[PDB]
Amino acid sequence: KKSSTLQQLISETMVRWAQESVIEDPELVRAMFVLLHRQYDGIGGLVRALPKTYTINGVSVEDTINLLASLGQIRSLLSVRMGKEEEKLMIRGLGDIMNNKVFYQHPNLMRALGMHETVMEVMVNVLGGGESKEITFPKMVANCCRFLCYFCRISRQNQKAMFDHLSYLLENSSVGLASPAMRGSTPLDVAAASVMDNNELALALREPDLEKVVRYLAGCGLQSCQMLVSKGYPDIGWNPVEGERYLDFLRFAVFCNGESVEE
Amino acid sequence: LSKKAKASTVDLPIESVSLSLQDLIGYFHPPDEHLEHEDKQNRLRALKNRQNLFQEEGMINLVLECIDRLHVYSSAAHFADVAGREAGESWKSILNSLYELLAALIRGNRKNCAQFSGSLDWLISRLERLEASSGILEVLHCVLVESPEALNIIKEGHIKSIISLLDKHGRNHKVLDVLCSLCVCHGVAVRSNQHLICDNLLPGRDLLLQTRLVNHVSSMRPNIFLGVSEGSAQYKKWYYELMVDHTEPFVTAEATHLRVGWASTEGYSPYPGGGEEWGGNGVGDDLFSYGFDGLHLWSGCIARTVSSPNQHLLRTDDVISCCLDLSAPSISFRINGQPVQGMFENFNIDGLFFPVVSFSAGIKVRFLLGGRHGEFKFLPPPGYAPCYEAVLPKEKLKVEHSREYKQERTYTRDLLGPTVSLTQAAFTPIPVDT
Amino acid sequence: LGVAQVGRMNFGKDVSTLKYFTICGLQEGYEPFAVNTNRDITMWLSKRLPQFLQVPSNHEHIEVTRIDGTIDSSPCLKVTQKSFGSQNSNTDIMFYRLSMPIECAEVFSKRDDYDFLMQTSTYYYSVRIFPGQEPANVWVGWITSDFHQYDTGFDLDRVRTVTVTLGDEKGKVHESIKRSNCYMVCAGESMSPGQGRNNNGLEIGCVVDAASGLLTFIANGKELSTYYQVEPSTKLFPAVFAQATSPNVFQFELGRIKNVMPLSAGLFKSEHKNPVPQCPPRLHVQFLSHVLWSRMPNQFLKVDVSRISERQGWLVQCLDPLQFMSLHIPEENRSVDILELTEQEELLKFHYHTLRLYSAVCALGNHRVAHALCSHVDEPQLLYAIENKYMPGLLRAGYYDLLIDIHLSSYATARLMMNNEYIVPMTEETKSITLFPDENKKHGLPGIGLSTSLRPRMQFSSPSFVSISNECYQYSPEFPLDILKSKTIQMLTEAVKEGSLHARDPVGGTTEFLFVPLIKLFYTLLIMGIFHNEDLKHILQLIEPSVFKEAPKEGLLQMKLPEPVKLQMCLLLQYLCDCQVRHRIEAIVAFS
Amino acid sequence: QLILLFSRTALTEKCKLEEDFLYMAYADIMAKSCHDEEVKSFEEKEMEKQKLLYQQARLHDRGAAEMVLQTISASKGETGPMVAATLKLGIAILNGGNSTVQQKMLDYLKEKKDVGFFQSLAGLMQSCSVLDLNAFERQNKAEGLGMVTEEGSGEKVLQDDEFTCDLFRFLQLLCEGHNSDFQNYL
Amino acid sequence: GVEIETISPGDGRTFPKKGQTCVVHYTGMLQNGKKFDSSRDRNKPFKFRIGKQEVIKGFEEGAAQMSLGQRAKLTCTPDVAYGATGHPGVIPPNATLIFDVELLNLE
């Protein structure tokens, strides 16, 4: 009889194709079965979509569209490889986000849009493409770290969302610690902002996460800084400059709101 | 051998190396498509493990050393002169097998293709040689496809060398595919490589095939078959006119074509010679036709700007008068009665001439052939006879397409074989000698 | 067909036209050759005008070998007759040329020194006539692309020439230009001492001054009297016309002489400053031949001619425009209709990969490269490729890809990235949105309706190169989107109607080439959101007439489609489902 | 076709078993279909058993038993949603000690000589979590200070008790009915 | 350095000044014969204002010398047309440009 509904039409068509012919293309098989599952589980579409739904006032429409365009420009940079022009685009794109008023008034919207994951992914791309070979494009990494720290300071929920990425950041702690004029702009600083002044997050912080920092500090206390001795600094066996940053992070992990987290 | 030892003293296992290279190629041969999925996956896993073990024992650098030490000899003749005639015979085969082995060792293995980054620069340095071009290209393609890290070392020099490979070795889609892989790898676009490839390949317009829209151009001529010959009852001077009732400068994005003049036929065949039957060509686009467009004299697809009072491209209500003198080869034009200040001279006269107009869409021209058929507005120059006077007594003067085929239903379309020569057009009396 | 023979070939596209089919063939069951074709069958005939093509390796008469240049020897290409001394050998003159031209300067000016070699533009090649080959039967010189003469008796007097004489208003000839396709000399006459070819092979050396267009010839170390002057921008191909009187005919030598830079420097741009002679694989001997085919156009210009009156003369009128897309081979200075690539497999494949490279260089939001590519591939060419029904499938699939990537890909991918995130303003227009259009709980047609959710802006930049500002590189180049949408709907409708009969002549050669590129463009346009209301209704009716009728014919869903077409149809259905979900989300927000 | 696609994806060699939403959904659908679920009579209990056998045959006749082994083998001992739902599907098709499914599973393993299956089983067992008193103390301290618990059940302590129970239930169903062959083969 | 050759006559009295948007159709081509741009291909007239270097200097001078309704050929040397650096991807270095320009309308 009459289907009269796109749902029933698709549910009939996928099954008809599958029963008519043996599909050779695995991508086609996935496509048809994804469509069939979507038709049958209609409520699941709402379950997935509603968390991504946001309502804004009519007066904020233009500012929200500008911020959405900026976020799209930042997102498109994932598809391209890191370069000078991409660094400039990323920098002024982040600048527009800070300047926009919607960024502060609607932190839940930004967390739902998942800007911090995108900035993280760009930083991961850079550290993969130039961590061991000394941090290339350091300015954009610094800007990303500053943006992420400001994201932590905007709202307490954003702080938890950022703390959920602590494990990677602690593994990329040794990015630009020994290089001054970049203080407050390394992934270790971002981790400190993630676990700064939040009792819940400090308690939730695990022992292996502290163990990573302790191991880094042990390495810095045992061996000198290769980049400094390359610049020609007198070679003392240990590294104070890198060690101090890890000490600061440990301080922020152990001490919170004037109280000392005993655990 | 390079240290100049005697061939007898030198132990050169040519046949053993060739057979071992064949066995290694068979060993690293990729799985076939007919195989079932599970078996294909098993073969793929086995090949991956073999490649891993080989590269961990450092079999890639050994192949590279063999290839490098073999390239010192310029050619098979040179290698034969150095070592021996079997060595010269098998030198190219050994190089090709070595390159194939390297490609098989690094294909589909990201770790190996990443370790090959250091040698990539040395690899591209021998791409110019015909002894190794195909193998080096295949190895480069495999590395670029497999390893993202490979792209980060490709600089302007390497891209320029790859592009110059097209200019030196001719068109080859494999170089194009390598250039494409240099643009986007694993869903990531390298903008620097994109810009370099664009700016180094596209602007030249000398390697890639070029495309353009060309307006269809048709040619129209009367029946008359003016000609010149010794001892032939034909009059050497001729004259006709064409008036453009209407013409649109731009019917389409391209400029409208409208040219008028004379065309010749190769030999005495009635078929016009030297030009395409259909296409964008017309009067003056070949060395058998002679045209005028109001500003340019056209011949051999070459246009020369010719001066005239009130210069303009052929417009509405323009009368062009064409004069032909075969006694001294001369084609002259006069626009609206004013004389055009250029003329064709000393053209080949071993053929039959006829008036012709070439055009694209948007013309309303009218042939004024003189006399009863057309009425000349400007009187012919002295001597020149109007073109209608060359019609044979039986035949009738009509304007028909220069070429055989025309727009009509396919099943009605007449297919014509070669035409017979029209030597009878020139009546040269041949009396029996007495 | 022979001399003066006329015939017609009926493929039976219209069965009634076939006059004798019924009495013989029909009951037997033989079918008309064009029984199930919606397009006229393209016809290929024997080319009248000979063209130059590379000497085949399997040629039974002419063999060409490449002699590499040693330290003391220049590179050589040796032309010899393998059939010499055997039965059925051809005693005819053959016309050989090199595959690449020397290009004269655009504007003509008004131990050898290395600096002189660097600054000079004169180029040299030579021809060694092997001793015993009658040099009177050998001609050496340069020819242009226009040379299409295969007279068995060749002489320097028959060469086609003209003299354009331009004079002032008074009539005094201020200039005269001689134009000819052939600029060659004969070795027999170049034997000024006589029997030069006897004691040793005769050497004719051709030198061309690309800066001034002077062509001169030196035989046995002395400059011959005959010289030529060519007009600027002429492309001259090295050429030898020889009637073989010996097993070995002649040898192209690409060497160099005092103060003259060799031929490879002039030919290749990379070696413009390389004194060393070279013979790269691109250079090869090409012989004039008639073994080529030619494609008749499917449609010709409609021209009407008639004698208006005795005074009016004859009238020739043409008012309907037609165009063909011409593919230009750069090195040969030739041009062929792109539809002729249906039988030239190598050019078809190379051009398909060139199109893929065009897509790749502008892929992923490279707007500046897209603007640059708009120069090479214009929007009229793109639209003609859109609409043409005879284009090869590979070229069709490549050209739709270019049309998508240069103009539509950036906005399409922006919309796809912003697809799954619904930010909806809370405004009076948003308040009106409801799940069901009326009291009857009947679903509205997907897509049609008022959607207020925030959507990325669509901005395009005009691709003009006379402008100087670089900001125009930002944004994808503009395209006639309305015309593109109308043509897409029209072609989809026609394709559905044709494929409903399963014709033997799909556009592009296969159902995949007919539908996959068309549906890809249609899906990209739908993703961007150009389609509006009534157009969306028509395309939905094309998709399925039964479900989407507003409250015999079969939609695309049930036409026994190939797998690649099925995948894109699945994508279309996914987009429709996403539209439904967005409508639901907006209705929930409106109720909120 | 769906089961064959899921089997081919598992059999394709990758360094890690990528999470697939399609498998996440359809494995759950198939698992629910099998069970399709106060005294009852003998006849109706036997009818339920017969219905469950037919609903399990609807899947294990089409390669589900092999697919739920291949997915576990490709898991390479990494706890995740994919193996978490593969275990549920295996339990669903193996409920009641299905001897046909047990025989199919044992025959497939013996024929393919799959060591990865048992290596992944051992890896999953090692990855299974247990009670963590330190996490419990931290959770209690958070409540004492007064921050609202994101999770009320203390899911940090005993991270995934469903996965461990499903794994050991699968391993038990593999041997129910006193299947000596599979008992020894384990 | 710009050469003007009239293909079609204009009015002969109206010429572009300060403050006027010139509306043209141009069919710019290289010297070899290959076409690299056409506002008629794009089907939209090109509008540019005089004296503020929106266009190249050769085009500017040619349009200044041209009159209303006049079609002319503009030959521009490299020194007034994109210089020696050229236009990356479109115009090669040191290339003279031939433009077929029609001045349709002036405000």
Numbering used by the authors:
A (entry chain C): 2053 to 2315
B (entry chain C): 436 to 869
C (entry chain C): 1207 to 1316, 1414 to 1854, 1889 to 1929
D (entry chain C): 3666 to 3702, 3710 to 3858
E (entry chain G): 2 to 108
Article, verbatim:
Here, we solved the cryogenic electron microscopy structures of ryanodine receptor 2 variants linked either to heart failure or inherited sudden cardiac death.
Moreover, by analyzing two different mutations at the same residue, we were able to determine whether the identity of the mutant residue differentially affects the local and global structures. Recombinant human isoforms of the PKA-phosphorylated CPVT-linked RyR2-R420Q and RyR2-R420W channels were expressed in HEK-293 cells and purified as previously described. Treatment with ARM210 reduced the RMSD values by 0.18 (n = 4, SD = 0.025, p = 0.0004) for the three CPVT channels and the HF channel analyzed, strongly confirming a common inhibitory mechanism. Similarly to RyR2-R2474S10, we detected an increased density in the cleft of the RY1&2 domain of RyR2-R420Q, RyR2-R420W treated with ARM210, where Rycals were shown to bind. We also detected an increased density in between the BSol1 and RY1&2 domains. This suggests that binding of ARM210 to the RY1&2 domain affects the local structure and stabilizes the interaction with the BSol1 domain, which in turn stabilizes the upward-inward conformation of the cytoplasmic shell associated with a stable closed pore of the channel in agreement with our previous reports.
